[model samples]
Structure formats: C-alpha cells, structure tokens
Target: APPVLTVRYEGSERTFAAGHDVVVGRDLRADVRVAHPLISRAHLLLRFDQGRWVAIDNGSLNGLYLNNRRVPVVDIYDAQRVHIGNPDGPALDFEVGR
Candidate 1:
C-alpha cells in the first residue's frame, strides 16, 4: 500500500501521497502549502525511499519538528506528527497505508 500524509490546520484537513521529493511549506508553490505565520516559504521536504517515508528539514528559519522535537532528517513512522516552524504549529499526520 502507498503511504499517506494527513495535514490538519485551522480545523481543516488535507491528504497527500508520500510522493518522491514532496515539499511542504508556506510557499504558494509548495506541494503542501500551509499559510501560517510561523512557517517558512520552503520549510520541509518529504520523500519516499528505501521502502520508507523520510522527512528532511529545509533549514528554514524556524525549523521542523517531529512529535515536538526538532530534527534535520528523520524516517517517518506510522502516526507520527510533523510540525513546521513551531512544535505547536500546523500538524501533519503520517501513516504507512492509505
């Protein structure tokens, strides 16, 4: 089964496939764009490789958070929470199966 990402912000939720080199940020052109003040224009990168989903922080001003801890790169696990800029910022829920 293909992996899925669930983004929840401001009471709304959206889903995206764990596509190769997928990007998430506040930029209008980002694969997953979240227009939050604390979020950077190009904040985080998500990609599927080595039979798993991975997240790479784009070295934004604020940075990326996985389950509240900041990290440069991380292998995403099922039900992990992703945060851009701040630990309490918009939440991206991750899962292996759609």
Candidate 2:
C-alpha cells in the first residue's frame, strides 16, 4: 500500500504522495525557507496514517492553530480541517489515504 497525504488550501484540497515534502507559503521562485513562513501568519502540515490524520507545525512564524486558539503544535487526525493564519486567509483541510 502507498501512503497518502492531503493538504487543504483555500477551499481546495490537494492530495500528495506519501513521504513527499509539502512546502507551504514560500515563493517557489526563490530558495524555500526551512521553516514555513506562515507561522507568523498561519500555516499547517497535515499527515495521514492508518486511517487517521495528524498535523504538525512546520515551525511557522505566527504558529499553528486549533479550535480558535494558537498552539505550539497539533497532531492531526482523519477528517480534521486545520485553519491556518486568519480564518479569512487560505485554510488547509486535508487527509491521507492509501
């Protein structure tokens, strides 16, 4: 079986192959930043495992958020939609499947 990962951005959900590096909020034209830039604004890294999902903060500038609160990091699970940055900004809602 192949591991699957999903990323939700701005009402659009993007699925990715497992183990692929998911880069967020960095200008692809320039060198990608080691840490995601949205931490100060909003960003999230979602992972899927065994019928479940998890989220990790790619070490953002602002931080990771859950349920309207800012947290250092969160472990995402299946069917969970993570809101990054301001609610008005692009949010990521995703999952992983194999």
Candidate 3:
C-alpha cells in the first residue's frame, strides 16, 4: 500500500491513491484534474519511489512552483503548497497521508 494524495484547486478537492503514478492536468482523464485553462493537458505527475513521494513536471508550459520557486522535481511529504502554473496561478495544495 502507498500514501494517499489530497489535492485542492479551483474550489474543489480530490484524493488520489499513490500506489501507481498519478497524472495531473487540465485534461479530463487526469487523476488530479485542474479545470483552469492555464493548466497543461499533462501538467504534472506524482509517484511513490522507494517509500517516498516525488513530483515531476511533464514539460508543461507554465511549469510547477514549490514554495514560490520553480522546480522540475521535488520530494514531497505530508502537506505541501504547489502551484501548477506560473507564480500568479492558483494553489493546488497537496496533502499526503499514510
């Protein structure tokens, strides 16, 4: 078993199982869907790596932000504030759980 990801954005919140790779984007098929137009079709990804969680950028236009800084990848745990688009974008809050 893996951790659960609680994602919040656009006035809605969603939860995804991290047992497999989770795709996040504006696309309807994404596991963590962001309805904003500024988001990419396959904007980002989340996966469990050796008992840890990692965030990956899917070559999106606006890119990802962690703690207000741009990063291609990040090791995530517990609660984190992540922005899917640019700095002016909305917060896609992430909360990982056991």
Candidate 4:
C-alpha cells in the first residue's frame, strides 16, 4: 500500500492515497470557501517544512488548528494533529504520513 493519511470526519473515514509527490490539502475540506465564504478570493497552499507542516491561509476568514488549538500562519510540524475549521463547527483533522 502507498503512504496514506486517513481522514475521519463525523464518523466516516477515508484514506488519501499517497504518491511520489506530496499531496496538498488532499485531506482538507474540499470547499473551504463554503465554510469561510471569503476564502474563495484567496490562493491557498500547503507545505511540509523541516518535519513541520504549514498551511498558507491566504487571508481566510476562518483559520486552521492543531488538536483544537490555533496555530500561527507559518510552518507547522507533523509531530502534531491538525484541525481546520471555526470554533463553532467541526474541524477537519490532518495526520502526516511516514
């Protein structure tokens, strides 16, 4: 099997099959703009940095998180689990693969 990141949301889970190239935002909300309307106007990007991962918010109304806690708009590490959504809603979880 390929390196994959399993995503679980609302009890349903799906694995993002990995490949030679890193998958950007593969396990994230498909329509982030629906959750944060203003996000549609921005150019989003994701990257892994020095064992840490970072997500470029691109001026989104709602931001990202790590285990329910908010993170800076900079490099984030794979050592932790990440959450992406508003406080009032269900945040998506991100797990880095080996």
Candidate scoring better on lDDT of 2 and 4: 2
C-alpha lDDT of candidate 1 relative to the true structure: 0.75
Better of 1 and 2 by TM-score: 1
The weakest ten consecutive residues by lDDT in model 2 span: 30-39
Give me the displacement of residue 69 in model 2, in angstroms: 2.4
- Please provide, for model 3 over 1-98, each residue's C-alpha lDDT reduced to its tens digit, 9 standing for 90 to 100: 67787777777887877577888899999988887888898899888787877889999998998878999987777888888788767677777884
Provide the lDDT at 14 for model 3: 77
* Model 2 lDDT, residue 86, Cα: 44
Candidate number that wins on lDDT, 3 or 4: 3
Cα lDDT of model 2 by residue, 1-98, tens digit: 55566665544555776553455554453111123444342244544455445566666655556777766555654455555554434465656563
Candidate 3 matches the true fold with a TM-score of 0.85
RMSD of 3: 1.7
Alpha-carbon local distance difference test for all models:
0.75, 0.52, 0.82, 0.44
Tens digit of per-residue lDDT, candidate 4, span 1-98: 33344444455554444332233232354522233342234323444444444555554445555555655554433433444445444444555564
Ranking by TM-score: 3, 1, 2, 4
lDDT of 1 by residue, 30-66 (tens): 8778898888888888877777778788888888787
Q: Local error of candidate 2 at 17, Å?
A: 1.9
Please provide TM-scores, in order, for all candidate models, with all chains considered together: 0.78, 0.60, 0.85, 0.43
